[PDB]
Amino acid sequence: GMKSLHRPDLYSWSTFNPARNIDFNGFAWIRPEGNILIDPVALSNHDWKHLESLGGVVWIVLTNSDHVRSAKEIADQTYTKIAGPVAEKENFPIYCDRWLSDGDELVPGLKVMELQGSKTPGELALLLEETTLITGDLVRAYRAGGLEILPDEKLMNKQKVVASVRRLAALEKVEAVLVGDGWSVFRDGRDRLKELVATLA
Amino acid sequence: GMKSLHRPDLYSWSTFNPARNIDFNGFAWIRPEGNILIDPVALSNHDWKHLESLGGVVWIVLTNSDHVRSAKEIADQTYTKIAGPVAEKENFPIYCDRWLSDGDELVPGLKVMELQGSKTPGELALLLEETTLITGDLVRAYRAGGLEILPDEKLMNKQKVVASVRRLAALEKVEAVLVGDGWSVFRDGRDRLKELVATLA
Ligand SMILES: [Cl-]
Ligand SMILES: [Mg+2]
Ligand SMILES: [Mg+2]
């Protein structure tokens, strides 16, 4: 079900993937101005009732094409708009109302960053009010307690990946790193990103 | 599903708690000499098969009577023994093959601690190879990233609870704090326990 995180207006719900054996995580930011979902996996019946009670959904943000997940189903059931990465605008699996690029702010406090060198071009990462970073696939966590990157054979350009991760590690106020795949970090996120950079340096 | 944690031989599987938007968590320590479950929640057929492939179950440790959870059902389908807190031996909800006291070591490396003042007497906490603390109910986590205790209204004696937590905080090598209710801590566990103590001082 939808669990509250390190702040009372952020939730995550997940689908276990039997093939790392790893949890695929969706995220919700609940706001009076309109709730926002990120890389949403399927919502259970309970989860829908909870989400409707919290005010529904006005935006779904997708970090990359492999994270389309249940976005189409959720859009068909609501009046939400969908935002995706501008680098994948010409061949995206679903219709998006808006294409996001590095430096955009979808709503006040939700900043967009494009990462290079990943398995898809211009994979998005989101900075929510400076202290919460949300990643799609490039930064993930199979071993609980740390942060990892996608393996080398899935990368378009490892040099660009290291540069991307350094940019994330340079975000001065990051406390939490919420990950689309695996174990999210809720405290000392900047320190976990720093350790990750050291493994790639 | 059952997922590996901060070390590859520890797993957790969980059931959602709609009252507080957090999970109820079971834990498994996979060992050549016999697997150990702690406060086990229900196992799906898939999780069963996964556990079976890892060697099954030899012991279930229950930290307190309120975490009996799915222990009966698992006991009925396996030859597991069950261990519980000696302080509740006279009225426990299921038959136990062994009663644990403070200082006991169930198997080498799995040290037992009795906590005082909680909602049940002599609630157990477990210290696995000095660096992983596993708690039942007294220490839990609703806000992801920290550690909390049960509210005052559930405690038998707050003064004893504070002394019990101070003791947990005195375990010098703790990095992970696995909790029966809510968000487990995988890194810097001692520091989270120290912060919790500070809120009770
Ligand atoms: Cl089942
Ligand atoms: Mg993924
Ligand atoms: Mg409990």
Give the DSSP per-residue string, A36-55: EEESPPPPPHHHHHHHHHTT
Return the number of other C-beta atoms located less than 10 Å from residue B136's C-beta. Answer: 26
Nearest alpha-carbon partner for A184 in A198, A197, A174, A199: A174
A60, A75 contact by CB (below 8 A): yes
In chain B, which among 171-200 make CB contacts under 8 A with chain A?
175-176, 183-184, 186-188, 192
Using CA atoms in the order A185, A189, A194, A199, what is the torsion angle rounded to 10 degrees? 0
Nearest alpha-carbon partner for A42 in A2, A101, A93: A2
A190, A169 contact by CB (below 8 A): yes
Nearest alpha-carbon partner for B193 in B127, B140, B151: B140
Whose atoms come closest to the Cα of B141: which ligand? 3
| Binding site feature residues of A for Mg(2+) | 67, 137, 181
Query: H or E segment at A74?
Result: helix A71-77
Experimental technique used?
X-ray
Please give the angle made by the CA atoms of A63, A69 and A73, to the nearest 5 degrees.
120
Rounded Cα distance between B90 and B14, Å, is 29
**Pairing mode, if any, of strands A176-179 and B123-128?**
unpaired
Residue B193 Cα distances to B103, B139, B149, B171, angstroms = 20, 9, 10, 10
Nearest alpha-carbon partner for B7 in B198, B176, B199, B200: B176
**Inter-chain touch B1–A11, beta carbons under 8 Å:** no
Alpha helices, H only, chain B: 45-53, 71-77, 158-169, 189-200
In A94-127, which positions are buried (b, 16+ CB within 10 angstroms) versus exposed (e)? eebeebbebebebeeebbbbbbbbbbbbbbbbbb
In residues, how long is chain A? 201
**Inter-chain touch A187–B145, beta carbons under 8 Å:** yes
How many angstroms does the Cα of residue A24 sit away from the middle of ligand 2? Answer: 7
3-state secondary structure of A143: coil
A177, A192 contact by CB (below 8 A): yes
CA atoms within 13 A on the CB side of B3: 25
The residues near A115 (Cβ < 8 Å, ≥ 6 apart) are: A122, A123, A124, A125, A138, A161, A164, A167, A168
Beta strands in B93-199, from DSSP E residues, in sequence order: 98-100, 110-115, 123-128, 132-135, 139-140, 148-149, 176-179
The DSSP 8-state label assigned to residue B154 in this structure reads: G
A62 token code pair: 């997708």
Q: How close, in Å, is residue A1 to chain B by CA atoms?
A: 6
Nearest alpha-carbon partner for B57 in B83, B24, B81, B25: B81
B187 token code pair: 């890194």
Q: What are the φ and ψ backbone dihedral angles of B182, each rounded to 5 degrees?
A: 100, -150
Tell me, what amino acid is at A117?
G
The residues near A162 (Cβ < 8 Å, ≥ 6 apart) are: A117, A197, A200, A201
Q: Which residues pair with A84 in a beta bridge?
A: A99
Nearest alpha-carbon partner for B182 in A5, A94, A128: A5
In B149-167, which positions are buried (b, 16+ CB within 10 angstroms) versus exposed (e)? bbeeeebeeeeebbebbee
Resolution (in Å) of the shown entry?
Answer: 1.6
Nearest alpha-carbon partner for B101 in B115, B91, B90, B120: B115
The residues near B200 (Cβ < 8 Å, ≥ 6 apart) are: B149, B161, B162, B165
3-state secondary structure of A96: coil
Chain A hits for B184, Cβ within 8 Å: 144
Closest chain B residue to A18, measured at CA = B1
Phi/psi zone of residue B75: left (φ > 0), alpha (ψ -120 to 50 degrees), beta? alpha
The residues near B150 (Cβ < 8 Å, ≥ 6 apart) are: B118, B119, B137, B138, B140, B161
Considering only the beta carbons, identify the residue of A1, A16, A188 that sits closest to B1.
A16
Please give the angle made by the CA atoms of A16, A177 and A201, to the nearest 5 degrees.
105
Q: Which residues pair with B179 in a beta bridge?
A: B135
Rounded Cα distance between B38 and A104, Å, is 47
B114 token code pair: 């009795």
Rg, C-alpha atoms of chain A: 16
List of long-range contacts for B107-110, beta carbons under 8 Å, 24+ apart? B107/B31, B107/B33, B107/B34, B107/B36, B107/B59, B110/B29, B110/B36
Tell which CATH classification among 3.40.50.1100, 3.40.50.2000, 1.20.1250.20, 3.60.15.10 matches the domain A1-201.
Answer: 3.60.15.10
Domain ranges of chain A: 1-201
Rounded Cα distance between B38 and B61, Å, is 5
Nearest alpha-carbon partner for A157 in A149, A167, A145: A149
